[model samples]
Target: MVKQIESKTAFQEALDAAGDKLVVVDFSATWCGPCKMIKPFFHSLSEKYSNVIFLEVDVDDCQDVASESEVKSMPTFQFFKKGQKVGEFSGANKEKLEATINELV
Candidate 1:
């Protein structure tokens, strides 16, 4: 299941895990065209990876996460390993997104 984190503090809770699983945070908004463009693929990845945890955060609704994570684009994906920010790929590159996930997970 997709985990939803509301507060900045709660975001840390997900990061605190010691497992090698990757945490993917999809920073998006319903109004963003690019966000809409990549969402289906993100969901596809979510279903494809069982160990990885995927989360969809509405940039408009969750300004705190966006601000803290410094999400500059509409559909930014942040990868975290063991509660630490590892790498991220922005924009709508599905191949790169998959590659990054492959590397992390």
Candidate 2:
């Protein structure tokens, strides 16, 4: 289950709660076609990696988060461990997505 984050406060709270493992934060916008295409994959990934915290941040609704995270693209996937970003992937590529998630997990 990909947790939908609506505000910067929630994002901060999630980070604070993330103990010491990698958390995948997906920053996306509803209007983005690629974002829609990857939504299911992200959702499945959240459940598949249930132990890892997966958060979906809406750029339009969560502007503060987008700004703070420096999200230049609509579907930027950021990997964080212990509240610190370790890696990120911009754009939707199945191979890269699977590889990144697999490597991180």
Candidate 3:
């Protein structure tokens, strides 16, 4: 299951729980078409990759977390490992997202 980051505190807690595993955070908005398209894909990945932690952050609901992460796009994917950001990209590119996750895993 994908964890929803509802606040700055929740985001930090997720990161801490991530530990040394790969953590994927999807920064998206409610009205974003691309984001809606990839929502299921993101959830699927979470189910498939049980070793990795998946998170969803609604930019509108978690403005502080989004701003802190420097998210400027509706569908931004941020990869973190060992509690530090390692890679990131924007858009709804499934192939690229899977490839990145595969590489990191």
Q: Relative to the true structure, how large is the alpha-carbon lDDT of every model?
A: 0.81, 0.84, 0.93
- Cand. 2 Cα-lDDT: 0.84
- Tens-place lDDT per residue, model 2, 1-105, is 777898778887888898886688888888899999988988888777778888998898988879888889778999988878889979977678778878876
Per residue, candidate 3 scores C-alpha lDDT tens digits across 1-105 of 999888899888899988789999999998999999999999999999999999999999988888889998779999999889999999999999999999997
Model 3 TM-score, 2 decimals: 0.97
Q: List clash counts for every candidate, in order.
A: 1, 0, 0
Runs off by more than 4 Å, candidate 3: none
The list of candidate 1 runs beyond 4 A from truth reads none
- Sort every candidate by TM-score, greatest first: 3, 2, 1
Estimate the overall C-alpha local distance difference test score of candidate 1: 0.81
Error of 1 at 25 (Å): 1.0
Query: Which 10-residue span in candidate 1 carries the lowest summed lDDT?
Result: 1-10
Score candidate 2 by TM-score against the native.
0.92
Candidate 1 TM-score over all chains jointly:
0.86
Alpha carbon lDDT of residue 34, candidate 1? 76
Per-residue lDDT value at 18 in model 2: 82
